[PDB]
Design an enzyme around this catalytic site. Structure first.
Site, short mmCIF file in Angstrom:
data_model
loop_
_atom_site.label_atom_id
_atom_site.label_comp_id
_atom_site.label_asym_id
_atom_site.label_seq_id
_atom_site.Cartn_x
_atom_site.Cartn_y
_atom_site.Cartn_z
CG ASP A 94 -1.88 -1.22 1.36
OD1 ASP A 94 -1.77 -2.21 0.58
OD2 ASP A 94 -2.66 -1.21 2.36
CE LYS A 159 -4.66 1.86 3.32
NZ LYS A 159 -3.63 1.01 3.94
CE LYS A 193 -6.50 -1.40 3.95
NZ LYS A 193 -5.15 -1.96 4.04
C1 LIG Z 1 -3.28 1.46 5.08
C2 LIG Z 1 -2.38 0.77 5.91
C3 LIG Z 1 -2.00 1.28 7.06
C4 LIG Z 1 -1.03 0.67 7.97
C5 LIG Z 1 -0.48 1.33 9.07
C6 LIG Z 1 0.45 0.70 9.88
C7 LIG Z 1 0.87 -0.57 9.56
CL1 LIG Z 1 2.03 -1.37 10.57
C8 LIG Z 1 0.39 -1.23 8.46
C9 LIG Z 1 -0.57 -0.61 7.68
#
Ligand SMILES: *C/C=C/c1ccc(Cl)cc1
Length: 242
Positions: A94, A159, A193
């Site tokens: 992401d 997302k 997402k």
């Molecule tokens: C969208 C994903 C956010 C996120 C924040 C912190 C971690 Cl460790 C993983 C994913």
């Protein structure tokens, strides 16, 4: 509500030391089924993978984050981070879109950044989600534009949010982004997402209902829809009797 909660649980990218990552992995294997993914920082991917394999849930995906949470506009840095995520063993990355650059009128850098990351991901059969940070964009036109650019550059998912700013997902920003997917004709290839703004089972039902109304009720499988939010898993499990 029970039906929507079970559905949402299986669409979760669950996020929270190695001990905490291991516990995360354990929590993703719930009494009513597995979440779609766990979400960890890149360095945690190897110990996560080991844990998921040891508990017999090797199909739980490992997602991580790059260019995060800042969404800076240095393509070489974002690409390096994405390549490292891939090398650590991510199933999904992401990446944060350079939303500040877009707000300053630079569309091209967002396209180039997403595309560079997508090329790396695609070479390794890794899915790329692009975080556009709807809570910083604020404006409908800018949310559409970031969504469009991301899709054109080859995003596999768009997302809403990092979860690290004051305002994360709202129903309206979810609707706008899914409308872009629909309007562009890319509902087969691009998922959505929701991050943040989904505290409760009732909230999750509302966000799923948007997808169901736009695309039909079969669209929101794990390739096309995900949730992440603090407290959501506990709320879903409560609704389901755990
Ligand atoms: C969208 C994903 C956010 C996120 C924040 C912190 C971690 Cl460790 C993983 C994913």
């Amino acid at each position: 509500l029970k039906a929507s909660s079970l559905r949402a649980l299986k669409l979760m990218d669950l996020s929270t030391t190695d001990e905490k990552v291991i516990a995360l992995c354990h929590q993703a294997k719930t009494p009513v089924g597995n979440t779609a993914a766990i979400s960890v920082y890149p360095r945690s991917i190897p110990i996560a993978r080991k844990t998921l394999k040891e508990q017999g849930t090797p199909e739980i995906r490992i997602a991580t984050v790059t260019n995060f949470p800042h969404g800076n506009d240095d393509i070489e840095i974002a690409l390096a981070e994405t390549r490292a995520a891939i090398a650590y063993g991510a199933d999904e990355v992401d990446v944060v879109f350079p939303y500040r650059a877009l707000m300053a009128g630079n569309e091209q850098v967002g396209f180039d950044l997403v595309k560079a990351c997508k090329e790396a991901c695609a070479a390794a059969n890794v899915l790329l989600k692009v975080i556009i940070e709807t809570g910083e964009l604020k404006d409908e036109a800018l949310i559409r534009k970031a969504s469009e650019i991301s899709i054109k550059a080859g995003a596999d998912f768009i997302k809403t949010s990092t979860g690290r700013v004051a305002v994360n997902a709202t129903p309206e920003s979810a609707r706008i982004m899914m409308e872009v997917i629909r309007d562009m004709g890319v509902e087969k290839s691009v998922g959505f997402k929701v991050t943040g703004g989904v505290s409760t089972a009732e909230d999750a039902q509302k966000y799923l209902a948007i997808a169901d109304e736009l695309f039909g009720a079969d669209w929101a499988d794990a390739r096309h829809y995900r949730f992440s939010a603090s407290g959501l898993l506990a709320s879903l499990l409560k609704a389901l009797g755990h």
